Design a protein around this ligand. Sequence first.
Ligand SMILES: [Ca+2]
Ligand SMILES: [Ca+2]
Ligand SMILES: [Mg+2]
Lengths: 197, 280, 112
Amino acid sequence: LTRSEAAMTVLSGHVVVCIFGDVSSALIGLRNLVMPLRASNFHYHELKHIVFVGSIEYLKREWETLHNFPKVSILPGTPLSRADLRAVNINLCDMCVILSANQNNIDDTSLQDKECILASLNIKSMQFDTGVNIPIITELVNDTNVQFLDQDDDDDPDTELYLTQPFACGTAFAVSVLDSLMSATYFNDNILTLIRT
Amino acid sequence: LESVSNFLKDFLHKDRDDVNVEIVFLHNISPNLELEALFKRHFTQVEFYQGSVLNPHDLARVKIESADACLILANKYCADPDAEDASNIMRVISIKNYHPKIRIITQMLQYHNKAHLLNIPSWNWKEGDDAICLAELKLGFIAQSCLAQGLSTMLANLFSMRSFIKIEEDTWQKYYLEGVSNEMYTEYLSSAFVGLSFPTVCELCFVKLKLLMIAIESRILINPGNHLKIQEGTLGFFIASDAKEVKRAFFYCKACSNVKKYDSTGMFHWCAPKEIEKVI
Amino acid sequence: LVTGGATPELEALIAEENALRGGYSTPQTLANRDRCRVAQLALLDGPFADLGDGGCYGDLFCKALLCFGIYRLRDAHLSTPSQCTKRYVITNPPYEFELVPTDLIFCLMQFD
Ligand SMILES: [Ca+2]
Ligand SMILES: [Ca+2]
Ligand SMILES: [Mg+2]
């Protein structure tokens, strides 16, 4: 889609996926986000539209894995660009997903989450004929940056991830919570098949 | 050492007024013996604490919730401007996350990174959050020197704090140093100047208060002319030898159509997306 | 003074779009062209030239509506000739300042 088509197309109750990446960045495996949203136990009318906002080289590297799915769109552009977010009706989405491919190929230990924090802040700052109520989920790779997603809360570096407000509300996620699955799957021998199902 | 000693020379200058402001440095590396000695020379007005701007405990140790402003200095000579700007972007989101209402002043190297900066929800340039973009101001100084040569020199001299150096030999330097003694200062004006015409106001304080009057201002209007000048709580920008001199601007005693030619605001000329193969 | 258009509206547009979209010259748009520009004027030829040899910085702000400095040749303060064309900047000279006919002056010029 060009900005024009996105702006005149009425998208409502849909999913916006914001991708940071480039030709060098690792594959995220975006089909693992798309497949659950395409399960045959949704009827074709209640099936949520999906739009990717991001670098075109990154999306055309994932495309071979997800070109079989119905109702998917690509807006080639920057997920920090207000004009691109305005064009995809970000105020009418059922979810905005913010995530980065360039998460661990940098050994700076402070740069990875940067653009995701700024994208989360930009959408909540945004105004419509009022953006603070938009449903956002942010992937974080550094555990400690979570307390940077909300401003109306008590931040403390010794508070565990599960107990912090952005996680308790379901607006932040990190792979560090999945470490308990080693132990859970050891004692409950079928439980990985349940969670996968 | 060079950044702190340059900063303290401009900040603690005697051409300013009674600056009681205490300066608190927050840096993750221990100071070397030279920089510890520079802090010993400023024992009553400078304090240093080791810590990280990215840690809310260290921001609490430095009392950011009661600081008048936070100043973020950039490495101008870094190997990669994008990594430096991305690091200074991190600092501002950390400081604003700990306290939304603190005034931040920051250097930025590249202009496209300054656009990312103002997408932070509590960054508010209407209440003094200042991004000093070096690429914008540099290329702008150069650009204004294409209309009038040497303008980039006097603009740079108006923000540097400097006393009047005296030299007796008839040289280009004696007349240059007199000019270098000036800086630009802000002050409020209202008593006996409310409702007067902008030129008259300039004439009075140039002729009898002996200070080079308001270059601008109500809003930020440079040299307005005979119209659009009636405001009671307006501010002026003056050129003067020091901050003690400009103060006499207060308590004035009266004793002695069919095609797109511009952008959507009309601020810049526009034509069309011309093409590279046509301008080559 | 330097960027030529640092106003709240322009800042809002480039923060939204990162680009300039061209627009039509509606009379409120066209009124935004009225802003001062920096310029240098020659003092050896023009309506100021009788001050130019008259030798004193009598500011004349009552005409065309603002001078703020001199661009003086590095070898103008001495009686011997020289081939040097380099000029140094004097910012805010005194009202009584001794000027010479081979001076340029920095000024802000109205739109017309
Ligand atoms: Ca927080
Ligand atoms: Ca001075
Ligand atoms: Mg102290």
